[PDB]
Design a protein around this ligand. Structure first.
Ligand SMILES: Nc1ncnc2c1ncn2[C@@H]1O[C@H](C[C@@H](N)CC[C@H](N)C(=O)O)[C@@H](O)[C@H]1O
Lengths: 292, 616
């Protein structure tokens, strides 16, 4: 398997999805399922795997057998599991962006998704027809992250290196709305509250925004933010300082993990055990954390 | 023949990608030398101790493939001008790392972005890299014609795009480049990779890039239209821009993914096939020292180039033809012999131009071929013994010192330079004026020099490089150059400068001149120098000219002349450029002095002829 692990996503039953890519050496490509999460990242004891043409910048589940991939090739790929879940086959590969597709997120309906890319463009996809519904050029720099609304099918967030955080609503004639520092880097909706979301910046600051509370959590760029599936959610923050932090309702630090020796790229909570949290990094480490 | 390259940000394997790009018809490939997403840490642990290798090996390509086929790209995560200090420190170390690796591979060019206003620290890290050894490395600054903020969709509800014209605002990306290259002090290793967008800006924005060192034009696939057949094409306005970029012989770069792969390439080759200049190609923006045929003796082949101009000599023959009829009517064609004196005959094309002029005019003439260059006299006297005969009298003397046996009806000369009088034609004809009859005709009878303010950061950098070892370090700015002006921008219509007439019947002959010219400038630009042309009246309506608006169609002789200035001068739209020119002379030398007095003042250039004199 490739060295640099990029994404880790648990599904319903507890299977772990891994997205990796080789960011050095001769060949620059990536790879894509572990029904035994403790067996990761060993390649010999996996359920399925496949090699794509280029690297994986971001991915996300599509239901229970679909994998939506953001590729370095500028294409959005959707991979699907067979009925036996032993093979990972490509469904379509649409080269619609002109640069690296850096972020992807599935809307609420599960039939539409949004992709951002370094071509400063944001596109809305229809996973059924394999076509691009709308193409928006609202930012003036690389689109860093897009995050669909958890419960509104036409609403999603986006941030770019133009220091803009845009709230979207494709039901309006002008769908983008700018939300009022340092460049934002990761976006995460609140799972239980509608008009509440969090974001981290390149300076290691996580902030709480309503439609403002902030705390200096990390010493480097905040790479991702994932809420816990509890009733009152925890906030897991991973950054380029190679540390993992778990925050509460008031953004206070409850847990801190420095197990990783390189950048921590993703984090996923276990659906079976709500206290277990799995993180991956560019050190090829899959660490399972027991959050108190 | 279009030199074209393919820009990519995704290269899974160099060997396979380079072959696929080459099989599509491209000549080179723009690729990153490190993985674009492989962000690296240089200061903080434990990420700074990341085990290698950091990128691909140099063994994956031959040395010649690195030298001629690969163009490196700065990683898009490197931001040396970040407001965060840690990101600056990492980006500085990373930028040097990728720059040094591109130099390690021996890459012909390297791409750096200009996508924001402040690139001061980006310019310093590049300036320190350039001043680390004298290596043949080129750097292409990727700057868009229209800023990304100025072409975004108007889809933000609470921040609508501007719908009113901002004249200088629409020129902001040129300001990004102008500031950047000024910080880098006009480095010859720094050029422009202009990026074309789907919607072109106003005409004055494209005109800003005239005279800029554009080595590449970047064409995204997303700007191409689609015909009925489904092939990519361009709008007529883009076609107009591609044709202008072809005159600069830029390298076109195709970026983005395939939306319709050699179709984009074949459309560029299609536009290239569908479009004086044959002789002037090769000398474009090549600085030359103006000839001084008086102080120096011209070589044989120098005369040979002068004579390969049939349009120039047919005008002289026609001028002599009309003057013979106007002086000898029909009833003395057998008894009236006109005394013609070719003052400066060279190898004798004007003597033959006089023979052909007397034949078609059916008049008798007596010729004197006066030449001071003794080597050219060898050509004249062999011409006179073999063909001309006793009709022509060769005189090996300076026309100012010659004691003529008789007086002439007509005197013919081609003592003009690119700036009319810069070869001292007035001084030579004045000294030759005493043996002209009281009703004598001088051909040419008058001539006038023209000047026009130009903008060309390219030519300014070329003059700047002409510094020599044992002379004033700024002497190269205080002397004119004969150059086929090419990549430049003429900011105002040329205006007449100095005028001389022959014969000068005035008793107080004085060839010293002082002229003040005010040029209306209707654009924002940067003044680097003044283009010089000339016009001359051989006889009545028979004229010669290198002034562009009235240029003699089909004449190869005389490229424009260039008067530079030491420091570039900023000129805003609506301002007037005022230049002052002096023609100075003593008993031994003639020279020009010039100064800018508006909108700001420059120094007086070449005072007392300290840097440039014309030998008398
Ligand atoms: N004071 C002078 N006396 C005699 N010859 C001169 C003088 N000044 C310049 N010349 C010559 O005039 C010529 C200048 C040439 N441009 C003309 C060449 C020739 N008339 C032609 O049409 O090709 C050179 O041969 C000079 O040597």
């Amino acid at each position: 398997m490739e060295r640099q692990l990029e994404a880790a996503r648990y599904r319903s039953d507890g299977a772990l999805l891994l997205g990796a890519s080789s960011l050095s050496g001769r060949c620059w490509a990536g790879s894509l399922l572990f029904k035994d999460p403790c067996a990761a990242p060993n390649e010999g004891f996996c359920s399925a795997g496949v090699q794509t043409e280029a690297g994986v910048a971001d991915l996300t589940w599509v239901g229970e057998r679909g994998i939506l991939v953001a590729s370095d090739s500028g294409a959005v790929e959707l991979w699907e599991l067979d009925e036996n879940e032993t093979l990972i086959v490509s469904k379509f590969c649409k080269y619609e962006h002109d640069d690296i597709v850096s972020t992807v997120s599935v809307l609420s309906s599960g039939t539409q998704a949004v992709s951002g890319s370094k071509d400063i463009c944001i596109k809305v996809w229809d996973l059924a027809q394999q076509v691009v519904l709308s193409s928006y050029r609202a930012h003036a720099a690389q689109v860093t992250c897009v995050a669909a609304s958890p419960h509104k099918d036409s609403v999603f967030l986006s941030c770019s290196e133009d220091n803009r955080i845009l709230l979207w609503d494709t039901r309006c004639p002008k769908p983008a709305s700018q939300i009022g520092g340092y460049l934002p880097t990761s976006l995460a909706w609140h799972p239980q509250q509608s008009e509440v979301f969090v974001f981290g910046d390149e300076n290691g600051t996580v902030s709480l925004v309503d439609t403002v509370l902030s705390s200096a959590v990390h010493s480097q760029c905040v790479t991702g933010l994932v809420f816990s599936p509890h009733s009152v959610p925890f906030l897991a923050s991973l950054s380029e300082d190679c540390s993992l932090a778990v925050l509460d309702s008031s953004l206070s630090e409850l847990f801190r993990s420095q197990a990783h020796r390189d950048f921590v790229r993703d984090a996923t909570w276990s659906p079976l055990n709500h206290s277990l949290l799995t993180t991956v990094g560019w050190d090829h480490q899959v660490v399972h954390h027991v959050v108190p | 023949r279009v030199s074209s390259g393919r820009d990519l940000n995704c290269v899974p394997e160099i060997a396979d990608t380079l072959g696929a790009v080459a099989k599509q018809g491209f000549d080179f490939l723009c690729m990153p030398v490190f993985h674009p997403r492989f962000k690296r840490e240089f200061i903080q642990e434990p990420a700074k101790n990341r085990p290698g290798p950091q990128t691909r090996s140099d063994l994956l390509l031959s040395g010649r493939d690195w030298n001629t086929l690969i163009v490196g790209k700065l990683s898009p995560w490197i931001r040396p001008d970040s407001k965060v200090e840690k990101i600056r420190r990492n980006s500085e170390a990373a930028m040097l790392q990728e720059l040094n690796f591109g130099a390690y591979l021996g890459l012909p060019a390297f791409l750096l972005p200009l996508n924001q206003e402040d690139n001061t620290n980006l310019a310093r890290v590049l300036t320190n890299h350039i001043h680390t050894g004298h290596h043949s490395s080129m750097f292409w600054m990727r700057v868009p014609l229209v800023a990304p903020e100025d072409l975004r969709d108007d889809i933000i509800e609470n921040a609508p795009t501007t719908h009113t014209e901002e004249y200088s605002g629409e020129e902001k990306t040129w300001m990004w480049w102008h500031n950047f290259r000024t910080l880098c002090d006009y480095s010859k290793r720094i050029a422009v990779a202009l990026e074309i967008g789907a919607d072109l800006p106003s005409n004055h924005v494209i005109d800003r890039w005239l005279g800029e060192p554009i080595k590449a034009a970047i064409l995204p696939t997303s700007i191409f239209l689609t015909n009925k057949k489904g092939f990519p094409v361009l709008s007529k306005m883009h076609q107009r821009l591609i044709f202008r970029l072809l005159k600069l012989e830029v390298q076109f770069i195709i970026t983005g993914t395939n939306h319709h792969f050699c179709s984009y390439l074949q459309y560029l080759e299609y536009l290239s096939q569908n479009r004086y200049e044959l002789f002037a190609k090769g000398y474009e923006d090549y600085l030359q020292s103006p000839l001084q045929p008086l102080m120096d003796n011209l070589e044989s082949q120098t005369y040979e180039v002068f004579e390969k101009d049939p349009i120039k000599y047919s005008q002289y023959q026609q001028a002599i033809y009309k003057c013979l009829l106007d002086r000898v009517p029909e009833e003395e064609k057998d008894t009236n012999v006109q005394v013609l004196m070719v003052l400066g005959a060279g190898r004798g094309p004007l003597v033959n131009a006089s023979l052909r002029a007397a034949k078609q005019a059916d008049r008798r003439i007596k010729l004197y071929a006066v030449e001071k260059n003794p080597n050219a006299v060898v050509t004249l006297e062999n011409w006179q013994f073999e063909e001309w005969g006793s009709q022509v009298t060769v005189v090996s003397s300076d026309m100012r010192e010659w004691v003529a046996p008789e007086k002439a009806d007509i005197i013919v000369s081609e003592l003009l330079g690119s700036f009319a009088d810069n070869e001292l034609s007035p001084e030579c004809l004045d000294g030759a004026q005493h043996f002209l009859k009281d009703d004598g005709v001088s051909i040419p009878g008058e001539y006038t020099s023209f000047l026009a303010p130009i903008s060309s950061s390219k030519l300014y950098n070329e003059v700047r490089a002409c510094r020599e070892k044992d002379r004033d370090p700024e002497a190269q700015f205080e002397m004119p150059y004969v150059v086929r002006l090419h990549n430049f921008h003429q900011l105002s219509a040329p205006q007449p400068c100095f005028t001389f007439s022959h014969p000068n019947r005035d008793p107080m002959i004085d060839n010293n001149r002082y002229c003040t010219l005010e040029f209306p400038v209707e654009v924002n630009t940067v003044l680097h120098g003044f283009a010089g042309y000339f016009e001359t009246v051989l006889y009545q309506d028979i004229t010669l000219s290198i002034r562009p608006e009235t240029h003699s169609p089909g004449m190869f002789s005389w490229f424009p002349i260039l008067f530079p200035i030491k420091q570039p001068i900023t000129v805003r739209e609506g301002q007037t450029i005022c230049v002052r020119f002096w023609r100075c002379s003593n008993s031994k030398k003639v020279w020009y002095e010039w100064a800018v007095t508006a909108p700001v003042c420059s120094a007086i250039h070449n005072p007392t002829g300290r840097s440039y004199t014309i030998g008398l």
